[PDB]
Amino acid sequence: DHRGMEVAEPEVLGVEFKNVLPVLTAEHRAMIQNALDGSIIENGNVATRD
Amino acid sequence: QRPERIKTTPYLEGDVLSSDSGPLLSVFALQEIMQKVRQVQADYMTATREVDFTVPDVQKILDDIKALAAEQVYKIVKVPSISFRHIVMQSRDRVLRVDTYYEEMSQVGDVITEDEPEKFYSTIIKKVRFIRGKGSFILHDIPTRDHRGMEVAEPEVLGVEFKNVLPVLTAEHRAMIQNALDGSIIENGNVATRDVDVFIGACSEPVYRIYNRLQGYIEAVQLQELRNSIGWLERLGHRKRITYSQEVLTDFRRQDTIWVLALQLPVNPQVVWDVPRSSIANLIMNIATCLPTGEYIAPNPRISSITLTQRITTTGPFAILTGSTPTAQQLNDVRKIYLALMFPGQIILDLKIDPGERMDPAVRMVAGVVGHLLFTAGGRFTNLTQNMARQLDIALNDYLLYMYNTRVQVNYGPTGEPLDFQIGRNQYDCNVFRADFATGTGYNGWATIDVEYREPAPYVHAQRYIRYCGIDSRELINPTTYGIGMTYHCYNEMLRMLVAAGKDSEAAYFRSMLPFHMVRFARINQIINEDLHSVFSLPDDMFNALLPDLIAGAHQNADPVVLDVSWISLWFAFNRSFEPTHRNEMLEVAPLIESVYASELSVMKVDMRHLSLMQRRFPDVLIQARPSHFWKAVLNDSPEAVKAVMNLSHSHNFINIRDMMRWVMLPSLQPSLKLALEEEAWAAANDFEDLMLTDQVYMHRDMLPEPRLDDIERFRQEGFYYTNMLEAPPEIDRVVQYTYEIARLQANMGQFRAALRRIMDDDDWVRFGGVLRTVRVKFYDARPPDDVLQGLPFSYDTIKYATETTIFYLIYNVEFSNTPDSLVLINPTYTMTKVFINKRIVERVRVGQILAVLNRRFVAYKGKMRIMDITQSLKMGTKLAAPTV
Incomplete structure (x- = not known):
C-alpha cells in the first residue's frame, strides 16, 4: 500500500533488476523508487468476481 | 399442561423413537457444513490460503456472553485521583505544579x-x-470533619498533593494556606437527611468529562427506564407463552439504595444483521x-393394519419400508430434513x-411421492x-409408469419433460x-397462502x-x-x-395418514413462529x-x-413428528445474551x-495504512467472547477491504453505559494534546543560560529554571x-x-510538522545528558523523520x-529542539496561588447510601403489578 491505493510489488513484474540497483547514483536511485509507486492496481471484474 | 397437548382418542399415541435438543x-449443523468444504477441497485440485475448519464449543460461548453482563464499567472509591503534584525548588516562595495526568498520558x-x-x-x-x-x-463515603460549626472537606479528597511545601514556608504563609484550606466547605451541610455530600475539588479536564457523563447517566436512568425493559419482556413472554409465577414486581424504591442499569432491552436488530x-x-x-427439547413419535401401528378374527389380517402396501430401521448415517439425514423445515x-x-x-429401486420410486407432499417449493420460499x-x-x-397391476392407458405429450402425460381412465393431467x-405447482403452497402477517x-x-x-x-x-375433512x-x-x-391401495395409505400428517405440520408451525422468534431470525x-434471487442466480x-x-x-x-416436550434451557436468558452481544x-x-x-x-504518518490495520487494532482490545460469535462460520478469513469498510459506514447502534461512556472519551481525544502527542516541533540553536550569581539568598528566591x-x-516570518x-x-x-546549517547560522527557526511524535516530560537538577540536550527531531539509520522527542526542565x-x-565557560552549550504544546503542564506558581x-x-x-446493580434481573419470566399503558 502507498497513500491509500494498492501497489504491486517489484517481484510480480516481469523484470529482474536487483543487480542494477547497487551501481546507481543518487539522482537515479530516487527515479526508479518513485516510478514503482505508479503501478496502481485496478480492481477489475470478470463474471461478477473480483 | 397445554390444551394442545391433551390426547383423548388413541390416534396420536406412538412409540418414542429418538430425541434432539x-x-x-x-x-x-456446524459439523455438517465444515465437513462439506473439507470433503470437496480434498477431492479436487484447489488453490487457496490454508484455513482450518474447526467446529467450536457453541455451548461454552453462550456461558461466556452471559458472564459478560456481570462486569462493572464504573468503580467505587472514596478518594479521587491526585491529578496535581508539586515540586519544591531551592526557593521558599515559588514552586512549580505538575499535572500528573499529562505526565501519565505520555507513558x-x-x-x-x-x-x-x-x-x-x-x-x-x-x-x-x-x-x-x-x-x-x-x-462513596468521603471523609469530612467539623470546623466552626461548619463541616469542611478533608484535605485528602482534594486533588492537590502539597505536603512537601509546608516546611519551606514562613509564619506569615502557613496561616494563609491553612485558612484557605478550611474554606472548602460542604454546601448546605448543616441540615440533616441530605443523602449527598457536595464540595469543590480539583481534577484534570479529560478525567472530569467522563465523571460528569457517568453521573449524568445515573441522573436519568432510573425506575422508568427499568419499567420499560420488563414491560417489553411481557410482550415476548406473551408470544412465546411462558408460565408466570404468582409473584409480581412493585415499583417501590427503598430510600437508602441507588439502582444502576447498564442495558436497554429493546434490541435494535439492525445491529446484529x-x-x-x-x-x-x-x-x-x-x-x-x-x-x-423434543422427541420423535411414530404413527399408530393400527393405521396400516386391521385384524379381523385371528389370521384374517389386512396387509399394508408399504410393509417392508415400515419394518426397516435407520442406520447411524440415515438417522442424521432425518435431522437434516427437520432442520430444513423449521428454517x-x-x-x-x-x-x-x-x-x-x-x-431397492422401489425405495427411490416411493421417495418421490413422499417428497411431493412433505416439502415446499412454493412461490414464497423453498x-x-x-x-x-x-x-x-x-x-x-x-413411479406412476411402473404398473404391476393391469395397465391403465397413458397419452404422452408432444414434449419430453418428465411428468408429461395423461394417466388413467379419467385422464388426470x-x-x-x-x-x-x-407458482409452486407440484409441492405444498399450491393453492395455499403459506405465509401471513x-x-x-x-x-x-x-x-x-x-x-x-x-x-x-x-x-x-x-x-x-x-x-374426515x-x-x-x-x-x-x-x-x-x-x-x-x-x-x-397406495392411495388408501396416504389417506389414513392425512390426519396424522397435518398434525405434524401444526406442531412445526408452533415451533417456527412461536419459539424460534429471536433477533437471530431472518428479517x-x-x-x-431469498427465492427470486435463487431463480435469477444473483449474488446474495x-x-x-x-x-x-x-x-x-x-x-x-x-x-416422525418431533413432538416438543420441554422448552430450551436458556430461553429465559435469551434477551440478555442478545443485548450484550x-x-x-x-x-x-x-x-x-x-x-x-x-x-x-494526517496523511504523512499513515503512508502504508490499509483499512484492515485498524480492524485488528479494535479486535485485539475487544472481549474474547464477542469475537467468537462473529467467527462461528470462520468469516474472519473471507472478508475483503470493501466489506469491512461498508460495515463501518452503516448507521446502527445500541445505546448502553459503555457506549455512552466510550463516546465521551473519543470526544475528549480530538485535541491530540490530551493524548500528549503533537506535530509542532520546532528547532532553534540556543545557548544554556549561565547566570552570574552575586547574592546567594536573592538568587535562590527567584527560582530560576530553564526549559x-x-x-x-x-x-510567521523568520521560520521555514x-x-x-x-x-x-x-x-x-x-x-x-x-x-539546516544555513538556517541555524541565520539565527532562524525551522518547523518539522506534518508527522506526529510521542512526547515525554523529564525533570533534571544537574546537567542533563547530551542525548537529551542535543536531541534532534530527525535521525538516520535514508532519514528517520518521526524521532521521539522529550521536554526537560x-x-x-x-x-x-x-x-x-x-x-561561565569559554565555549557555550547548544540546545536545539523546542516543543510547543498549548497545555499548562508545568507552571511556576507562587505560594499565594497554590489553592x-x-x-x-x-x-x-453518604455512608448510608448503597449502590446495587439491577442489570442481572432482566430475566424473561417475571410479571409486574401495574403493567405498561
Whole structure:
C-alpha cells in the first residue's frame, strides 16, 4: 500500500533488476523508487468476481 | 399442561423413537457444513490460503456472553485521583505544579513511528481506553470533619498533593494556606437527611468529562427506564407463552439504595444483521438458544393394519419400508430434513449421490411421492434446491409408469419433460406435478397462502407467521371441519391421481395418514413462529428475496446453507413428528445474551468509525495504512467472547477491504453505559494534546543560560529554571516550513545537512510538522545528558523523520560555596529542539496561588447510601403489578 491505493510489488513484474540497483547514483536511485509507486492496481471484474 | 397437548382418542399415541435438543442440533449443523468444504477441497485440485475448519464449543460461548453482563464499567472509591503534584525548588516562595495526568498520558502507548501503521492504530486505542478507565468513579463515603460549626472537606479528597511545601514556608504563609484550606466547605451541610455530600475539588479536564457523563447517566436512568425493559419482556413472554409465577414486581424504591442499569432491552436488530458475512453464524446462534427439547413419535401401528378374527389380517402396501430401521448415517439425514423445515428459506436440500449404498429401486420410486407432499417449493420460499426439484420428478415419473397391476392407458405429450402425460381412465393431467418455482405447482403452497402477517411482533424485524399447508396452530384446540375433512390442496390432488394411476391401495395409505400428517405440520408451525422468534431470525426484507434471487442466480449476502439428504431419509422423515416436550434451557436468558452481544458491537463500530478518519487528518504518518490495520487494532482490545460469535462460520478469513469498510459506514447502534461512556472519551481525544502527542516541533540553536550569581539568598528566591517548552510559537516570518516529502528528497542527495546549517547560522527557526511524535516530560537538577540536550527531531539509520522527542526542565541548584563567576565557560552549550504544546503542564506558581486550582465540583453519596446493580434481573419470566399503558 502507498497513500491509500494498492501497489504491486517489484517481484510480480516481469523484470529482474536487483543487480542494477547497487551501481546507481543518487539522482537515479530516487527515479526508479518513485516510478514503482505508479503501478496502481485496478480492481477489475470478470463474471461478477473480483 | 397445554390444551394442545391433551390426547383423548388413541390416534396420536406412538412409540418414542429418538430425541434432539437445543445445543445438540447447533453443534451438528456446524459439523455438517465444515465437513462439506473439507470433503470437496480434498477431492479436487484447489488453490487457496490454508484455513482450518474447526467446529467450536457453541455451548461454552453462550456461558461466556452471559458472564459478560456481570462486569462493572464504573468503580467505587472514596478518594479521587491526585491529578496535581508539586515540586519544591531551592526557593521558599515559588514552586512549580505538575499535572500528573499529562505526565501519565505520555507513558501509555508505544513510540509512534512512521513505518508501522498497525502499532499507531493500537497506540490510540490504548490511550483512549485509559481515559475511560481513569475517569469513572462514584465517590462513596468521603471523609469530612467539623470546623466552626461548619463541616469542611478533608484535605485528602482534594486533588492537590502539597505536603512537601509546608516546611519551606514562613509564619506569615502557613496561616494563609491553612485558612484557605478550611474554606472548602460542604454546601448546605448543616441540615440533616441530605443523602449527598457536595464540595469543590480539583481534577484534570479529560478525567472530569467522563465523571460528569457517568453521573449524568445515573441522573436519568432510573425506575422508568427499568419499567420499560420488563414491560417489553411481557410482550415476548406473551408470544412465546411462558408460565408466570404468582409473584409480581412493585415499583417501590427503598430510600437508602441507588439502582444502576447498564442495558436497554429493546434490541435494535439492525445491529446484529449488519456484521459482514454472518448469515451462517446467526443461524447457529438461533438454534443454540431457542430450539426446544423434543422427541420423535411414530404413527399408530393400527393405521396400516386391521385384524379381523385371528389370521384374517389386512396387509399394508408399504410393509417392508415400515419394518426397516435407520442406520447411524440415515438417522442424521432425518435431522437434516427437520432442520430444513423449521428454517424455511435458510436451509435447503440436495440428493447425496454416492455409490456406497445399495437399496431397492422401489425405495427411490416411493421417495418421490413422499417428497411431493412433505416439502415446499412454493412461490414464497423453498426447502429444496432447483436441482432436487428435478430429481424428485423423475422419481415420480418412474413411479406412476411402473404398473404391476393391469395397465391403465397413458397419452404422452408432444414434449419430453418428465411428468408429461395423461394417466388413467379419467385422464388426470400429470403436468401440474412438475416443479415450477414461480407458482409452486407440484409441492405444498399450491393453492395455499403459506405465509401471513398478523398483529405486530415484539421483535420488530420479523413480522411474518409461517403456515405450512394452511394449518393455523389454533386448529388443534378449536378445529374447523370434521374428522374426515382435514385436507389441503396439494395433498388432495396427489390422492385423486394415485386413484387414477391404478394404485388405489397406495392411495388408501396416504389417506389414513392425512390426519396424522397435518398434525405434524401444526406442531412445526408452533415451533417456527412461536419459539424460534429471536433477533437471530431472518428479517422480512431478506426473507422475501431469498427465492427470486435463487431463480435469477444473483449474488446474495444471505446465501442459503445447502445440506444434503439421502434417498431413504425421505421415507423415515414421513413417519416422525418431533413432538416438543420441554422448552430450551436458556430461553429465559435469551434477551440478555442478545443485548450484550449487540451492545459490544456498538463499541467496536464507533471505535473503528473514529480511527478510519485518522489517515485523512494526517496523511504523512499513515503512508502504508490499509483499512484492515485498524480492524485488528479494535479486535485485539475487544472481549474474547464477542469475537467468537462473529467467527462461528470462520468469516474472519473471507472478508475483503470493501466489506469491512461498508460495515463501518452503516448507521446502527445500541445505546448502553459503555457506549455512552466510550463516546465521551473519543470526544475528549480530538485535541491530540490530551493524548500528549503533537506535530509542532520546532528547532532553534540556543545557548544554556549561565547566570552570574552575586547574592546567594536573592538568587535562590527567584527560582530560576530553564526549559525548551515554548510559551508561544514564533512569528510567521523568520521560520521555514519543512514537510516530510521535502526533507526526505534533500536527504537522499546529501543536500539536507547543508540546508539546516544555513538556517541555524541565520539565527532562524525551522518547523518539522506534518508527522506526529510521542512526547515525554523529564525533570533534571544537574546537567542533563547530551542525548537529551542535543536531541534532534530527525535521525538516520535514508532519514528517520518521526524521532521521539522529550521536554526537560533544568532546575538550577546552588550552594554557599560558589564563585560569583563559577559556571561561565569559554565555549557555550547548544540546545536545539523546542516543543510547543498549548497545555499548562508545568507552571511556576507562587505560594499565594497554590489553592487557586480547586474549581471543579464533586458530589458524594453518604455512608448510608448503597449502590446495587439491577442489570442481572432482566430475566424473561417475571410479571409486574401495574403493567405498561
